[PDB]
Design a protein around this nucleic acid. Structure first.
Ligand SMILES: [Cl-]
Ligand SMILES: [Cl-]
Ligand SMILES: [Cl-]
Ligand SMILES: [Cl-]
Ligand SMILES: [Cl-]
Ligand SMILES: [Cl-]
Ligand SMILES: [Cl-]
Ligand SMILES: [Mg+2]
Ligand SMILES: [Mg+2]
Ligand SMILES: [Mg+2]
Ligand SMILES: [Mg+2]
Ligand SMILES: [Mg+2]
Ligand SMILES: [Mg+2]
Ligand SMILES: [Mg+2]
Ligand SMILES: [Mg+2]
Ligand SMILES: [Mg+2]
Ligand SMILES: [Mg+2]
Ligand code: NA
Ligand code: NA
Ligand code: NA
Ligand code: NA
Ligand code: NA
Ligand code: NA
Ligand code: NA
Ligand code: NA
Ligand code: NA
Ligand code: NA
Ligand SMILES: [Sr+2]
Ligand SMILES: [Sr+2]
Ligand SMILES: [Sr+2]
Ligand SMILES: [Sr+2]
Ligand SMILES: [Sr+2]
Ligand SMILES: [Sr+2]
Ligand SMILES: [Sr+2]
Ligand SMILES: [Sr+2]
Ligand SMILES: [Sr+2]
Ligand SMILES: [Sr+2]
Ligand SMILES: [Sr+2]
Lengths: 142, 142, 150
RNA sequence: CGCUCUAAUUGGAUGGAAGCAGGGGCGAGAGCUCCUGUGGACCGAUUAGUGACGAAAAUCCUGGCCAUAGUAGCAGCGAUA
RNA sequence: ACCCUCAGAAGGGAGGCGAAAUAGAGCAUGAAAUCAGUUGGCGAUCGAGCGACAGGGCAUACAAGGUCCCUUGACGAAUGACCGAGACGCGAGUCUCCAGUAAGACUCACGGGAAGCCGAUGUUCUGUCGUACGUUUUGAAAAACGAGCCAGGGAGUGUGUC
């Protein structure tokens, strides 16, 4: 009748009262775009970051309004850095034997793009019975 | 013809700039001000010097223009514009909800705001806006 | 060439197309814009009048130096581009002919779509002064047409 | 951090690889990664290597394209047809 | 192929083959600049390094993100009272007490609500700062030099000795 996702889509990991605070900080605070200077002015100048090198550069000089430059103080907490917004830590899977050593109470799983439906069916069922959520589930016609 | 004014102000013997400044402040608060008896308004100082300044503003201009009002009608309306950011969104809406009138088109008498009034018994060196207008080149229509 | 930029239901439609036409692209835009919404028949007679020079085609985007015409409405500049009009007529003739074969009333169908596309140029070269030569090109145009039942 | 090719270990693909388009997640960031569509045969990861390895700029080179513009020219000549 | 159309071995339409014609002839894929048609936003009274950060309008199929608003309550850093009671000052106003109390960012809990709803993307309005970039120069937004745009190309390599 309708489309239903394989697995445990509605799963949440149990984190410490601290990690769950440091995530609710990262989400709240955030960070700026950090796109390259004048990327919007020229089409040949890409969106990917480059250090403003010019001696007179307004972004380099600090001059407020010309964007924020990449610094160490802009990082996210050591504790939460690199966690999926659900709280989960990502584990990249390519085959069924990649699911070994995974804690479904902390680590969720992300199957690669290269993997096909025949092997995806095998990884998805073996991830459900082991208690691990797949972040990119196949949607079946149920 | 018809203007739903919140506040109606009487300019009779009231120091021009000081009235204008309170009318400007109120326009930005969201009030529909209406300055009445502009002909009967006043400006302190030597008549000969106040006239020279106003006569110069009429001589000023080029192909682009610089329209300066001669009638005491608009002279008050332009002084109010000089206290409002008339080139911004907010400042245009506030200015356009302020209109100055010669005499009184209403039935209700206008109020005299605090600190604006001049004491004729204590002063002799001043001018009437209508006296400035007859010297500028207007037609006494009040 | 080009493929039809819009979709259509064969039971209620009739398609037509022009290929690599050596005419003015800029004229083909304005003619297209103007005959959109009109009936294939109302549009035929319109173009027949443009050829004779009775009804002008409003030159809205490509209007530099063009004098104003009185018969234009909502605009000032216009011209009578007869070459492209005659080409557009061949498109409307092919359209009615393809429609009547399917049982449709050709001269009674609305122009759902009409768009001109510049499918390159046919190159040339003109010998200019000082031992130099500058391009002297001709535009190759394609134009689509979809006729719908009202 | 990213690029190429070699070697060891180990993986993914016609149950659809790379590439591209649009969209989601990540890292301060260089980048990384997934989803959808297109595509229809290749593609990774770790380690240790190799280098014709990273671009916005040089009146840079080559190609392609836009504005210029339906604009100047298609009149001037003792041969005005 | 056939049929229709056309002045027509053109082109067009229908149709046929193939997994695929958007594989149909410079015919694998098909980026950018750019063009046409069209969708969302803006728009004929209004001001210009085109944006960064904040915050409102409008717009959004799924997937890959799932949060967000309000009553109330817990916690509660620096900071921090009104009113009132007493006491001073020509005066605006002040001191003492009430009290480092009420309050106070963030975070959390019970209950309640939103799913274009939260994020995010597009556009646009407001606030804030804001005269590109690279180079030359004591000093560059510069009436100092360079580029029309995009793509691809484009500069510490080799041997020998120290
Ligand atoms: Cl770091
Ligand atoms: Cl003037
Ligand atoms: Cl202003
Ligand atoms: Cl006096
Ligand atoms: Cl053209
Ligand atoms: Cl916190
Ligand atoms: Cl070096
Ligand atoms: Mg760009
Ligand atoms: Mg002209
Ligand atoms: Mg020569
Ligand atoms: Mg290995
Ligand atoms: Mg390169
Ligand atoms: Mg550079
Ligand atoms: Mg011109
Ligand atoms: Mg003759
Ligand atoms: Mg091809
Ligand atoms: Mg110098
Ligand atoms: Na004065
Ligand atoms: Na003047
Ligand atoms: Na135009
Ligand atoms: Na007209
Ligand atoms: Na008319
Ligand atoms: Na917005
Ligand atoms: Na230089
Ligand atoms: Na500069
Ligand atoms: Na200068
Ligand atoms: Na050029
Ligand atoms: Sr894929
Ligand atoms: Sr005030
Ligand atoms: Sr134009
Ligand atoms: Sr495209
Ligand atoms: Sr190189
Ligand atoms: Sr051209
Ligand atoms: Sr002649
Ligand atoms: Sr000549
Ligand atoms: Sr066909
Ligand atoms: Sr200005
Ligand atoms: Sr406290």
């Amino acid at each position: 009748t309708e489309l239903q996702a394989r697995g445990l889509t509605e799963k949440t990991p149990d984190l410490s009262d601290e990690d769950a605070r440091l995530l609710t900080q990262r989400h709240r605070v955030g960070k700026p775009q950090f796109n390259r200077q004048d990327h919007h002015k020229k089409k040949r100048v890409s969106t990917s970051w480059r250090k403003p090198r010019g001696q007179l550069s307004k972004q380099r000089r600090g001059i407020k309004g010309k964007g924020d430059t990449v610094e160490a103080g802009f990082r996210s907490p050591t504790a939460v850095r690199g966690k999926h917004p659900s709280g989960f830590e990502e584990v990249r899977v390519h085959n069924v034997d990649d699911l070994e050593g995974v804690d479904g109470d902390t680590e969720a799983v992300r199957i690669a793009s290269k993997v096909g439906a025949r092997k995806r069916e095998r990884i998805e069922e073996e991830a459900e019975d082991a208690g691990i959520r797949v972040l990119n589930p196949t949607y079946v016609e149920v | 013809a018809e203007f739903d004014a919140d506040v109606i102000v009487d300019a009779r013997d009231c120091i021009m700039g000081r009235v204008a400044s309170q009318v400007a402040e109120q326009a930005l608060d969201g009030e529909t001000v209406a300055v009445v008896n502009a002909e009967r308004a006043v400006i302190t100082g030597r008549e000969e010097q106040i006239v020279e300044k106003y006569e110069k503003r009429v001589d000023i201009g080029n192909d682009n223009g610089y329209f300066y009002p001669k009638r005491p009608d608009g002279i008050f309306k332009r002084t109010i514009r000089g206290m409002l950011p008339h080139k911004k969104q907010r400042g245009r809406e506030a200015f356009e909800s302020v209109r100055v009138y010669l005499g009184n088109p209403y039935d209700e008498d206008g109020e005299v705001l605090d600190g604006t009034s001049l004491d004729r018994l204590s002063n002799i060196k001043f001018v009437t806006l209508g006296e400035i207008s007859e010297t500028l080149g207007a037609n006494k229509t009040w | 060439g080009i493929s039809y930029s819009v979709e259509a239901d064969p039971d209620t439609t009739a398609k037509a197309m022009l290929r690599e036409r050596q005419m003015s692209f800029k004229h083909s835009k304005a003619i297209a814009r103007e005959i959109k919404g009109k009936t294939a028949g109302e549009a035929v007679d319109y173009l027949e009048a443009v050829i004779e020079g009775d009804q002008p085609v409003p030159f809205k985007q490509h209007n530099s130096g063009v004098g104003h015409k009185s018969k234009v409405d909502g605009w000032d500049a216009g011209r009578y581009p007869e070459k492209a009009s005659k080409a557009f007529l061949d498109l409307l003739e092919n359209a009615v002919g393809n429609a009547d074969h399917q049982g449709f009333d050709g001269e009674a169908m609305t122009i759902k779509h009409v768009a001109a596309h510049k499918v390159g140029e046919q190159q040339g070269r003109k010998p200019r002064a000082m031992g130099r030569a500058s391009a002297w090109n001709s535009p190759q145009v394609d134009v689509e047409l979809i006729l719908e039942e009202p």
